Design a protein around this ligand. Structure first.
Ligand SMILES: *C(=O)/C=C\c1ccc(O)cc1
Length: 125
């Protein structure tokens, strides 16, 4: 397994070196979106939480297509504020409940070392 801690301070650096295969080796959910909320990477752990087959949701829009409950000032709004600012690093709990058993999760959004990419780390609480 990949030894990366959820919430680590230099995580963006650590995952920068990871391909899709290795990303599935993480101990938590990992999603990489571009500036518009489209899905670039999506590991199996995140699939374990929501029920999405990793390969099937990539290319989809997270907020419009995949996770509509996250479309609110409390999630999507924080994301759109960060992209525009060119800086994002916020952690907060949330309840995943669209087409699934309400699952309470801890969410960590942070700008990736890459140009226009943003990470969404999730773990059960
Ligand atoms: C709200 O909709 C939050 C998370 C989420 C993501 C994917 C799926 O399928 C359900 C729920």
């Amino acid at each position: 397994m990949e030894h990366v801690a959820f919430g680590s301070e230099d995580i963006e650096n650590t995952l920068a070196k990871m391909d899709d295969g290795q990303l599935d080796g993480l101990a938590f959910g990992a999603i990489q979106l571009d500036g518009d909320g489209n899905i670039l990477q999506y590991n199996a752990a995140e699939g374990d939480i929501t029920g999405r087959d990793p390969k099937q949701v990539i290319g989809k829009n997270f907020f419009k297509d995949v996770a509509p409950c996250t479309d609110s000032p409390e999630f999507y709004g924080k994301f759109k504020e960060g992209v525009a600012s060119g800086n994002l690093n916020t952690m907060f709990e949330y309840t995943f409940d669209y087409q699934m058993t309400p699952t309470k999760v801890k969410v960590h959004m942070k700008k990736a070392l890459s140009g226009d990419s943003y990470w969404v780390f999730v773990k059960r609480v």
